[PDB]
């Protein structure tokens, strides 16, 4: 018959790594996790206590409560036509700080800095971000770069 | 053909022209649809919309909330206008003098404010005193106090008041409601 357990179809998903098996480095435990920190959930096969479900591998969440050795995470889960709020308890081995939020914070610092310097002269610093614009004109010169003409090649078997 | 991004011929979903066949309410609406059209004041927009509303969207404001309303900072002189019904609260033994504008007062409320030095007025008299709703405040009664709302949404693990005719012991207070008898909820 059919077989739907907790770790069904997780063969390669919780497979450890290439050449990284064994005890985990202690930067994973030295970390400090606050309420409201944005985290991603990558499991660790060695640590069996406090593993998440397969459904949350690679899913990013936010910390709501913190415990002695583990951490609670808020996850929104698509079921039906909606998002149902899901709460997970995870040891800090299967949780790592989401770096996605981080580059926005460094953007705020420059964004706050540029406005502060701009108001001294009022130049409309244009703090927004722009997408990649179409290129503008240029002059390409042929000193020592004279064009060389290429032609289609005939057929050969090479075997 | 067209690829519609939204449903076609969708009515607004809001109520205009209240469905009651009371002639007097229609006159009140007519006075305030003219007023909201030609005064450019947000107060007459509210009252005209409120005159549309249904009975459960007009919960009965009691004289106690009015008293609490007048005990707000700098509101004891504002005219109180209730688009709905005003009932009596025998749970308070004092009362201010402020006048009230409403559709219907109860006899106990009509006796109450009149005894306390006030004077209960209708909505048209409000218009000829406050065409732009000057020095007024809208009081809305508690909508979620009706016994039907307690039953809305019931399912497992939310405690939402089962529909029941006869209550007490041995009426759905059994397996499903305790861990001693099966699961609980």
């Amino acid at each position: 018959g059919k077989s739907h357990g907790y770790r069904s179809r997780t063969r390669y998903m919780f497979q450890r790594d290439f050449r990284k098996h064994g005890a985990v480095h202690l930067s994973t435990y030295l970390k400090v996790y606050k309420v409201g920190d944005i985290v991603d959930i990558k499991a660790n096969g060695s640590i069996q206590k406090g593993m998440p479900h397969k459904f949350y591998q690679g899913k990013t969440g936010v910390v709501y409560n913190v415990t002695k050795s583990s951490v609670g995470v808020i996850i929104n889960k698509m079921v039906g036509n909606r998002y149902l709020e899901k709460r997970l308890n995870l040891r800090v081995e299967h949780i790592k700080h989401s770096k996605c939020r981080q580059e926005f914070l460094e953007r705020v610092k420059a964004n706050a800095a540029k406005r502060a310097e701009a108001k001294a002269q009022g130049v409309a610093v244009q703090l927004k971000r722009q997408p990649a614009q179409p290129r503008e004109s240029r002059i390409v010169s042929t000193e020592g770069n004279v064009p060389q003409t290429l032609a289609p090649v005939p057929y050969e078997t090479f075997i | 053909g067209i690829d519609h991004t939204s449903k076609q011929h969708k009515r607004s979903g809001h109520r205009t022209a209240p469905k009651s066949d009371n002639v007097y309410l229609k006159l009140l609406v007519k006075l305030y649809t003219f007023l909201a059209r030609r005064t450019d004041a947000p107060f007459n927009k509210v009252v005209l919309k409120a005159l549309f509303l249904s009975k459960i969207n007009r919960p009965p404001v009691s004289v106690s909330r009015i008293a609490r309303a007048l005990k707000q900072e700098g509101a004891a002189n504002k005219t109180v206008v209730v688009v709905g019904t005003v009932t009596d609260d025998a749970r308070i033994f004092e009362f201010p003098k402020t006048t009230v504008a409403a559709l219907r007062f109860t006899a106990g409320a009509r006796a109450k404010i009149v005894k306390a030095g006030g004077e209960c007025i209708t909505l048209d008299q409000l218009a000829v005193r406050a065409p732009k709703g000057q020095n007024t405040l809208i009081l809305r009664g508690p909508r979620n106090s009706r016994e039907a709302v307690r039953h809305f949404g019931m399912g497992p693990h939310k405690g939402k008041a089962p529909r029941i005719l006869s209550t007490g012991r041995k009426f759905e207070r059994a397996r499903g409601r305790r861990r001693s008898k099966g699961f609980k909820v």
Binding site: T142, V146, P147, T149 | -
Partner: protein, 51 residues
């Protein structure tokens, strides 16, 4: 009540563009450009005529 079109009905055109009168009277649609006598470099012509 009725959409009249520019690009015709000259009266409607002048309504939307005060510059149409002087654009036409000056014949800016058939204006002439001053001649220039510059010629391409020798490297350009050989490349264009290259095999």
């Amino acid at each position: 009540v009725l959409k009249k079109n520019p690009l015709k009905n000259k009266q409607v055109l002048l309504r939307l563009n005060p510059y149409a009168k002087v654009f036409a009277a000056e014949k800016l649609g058939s204006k002439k450009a001053e001649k220039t006598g510059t010629k391409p470099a020798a490297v350009f012509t050989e490349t264009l005529k290259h095999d």
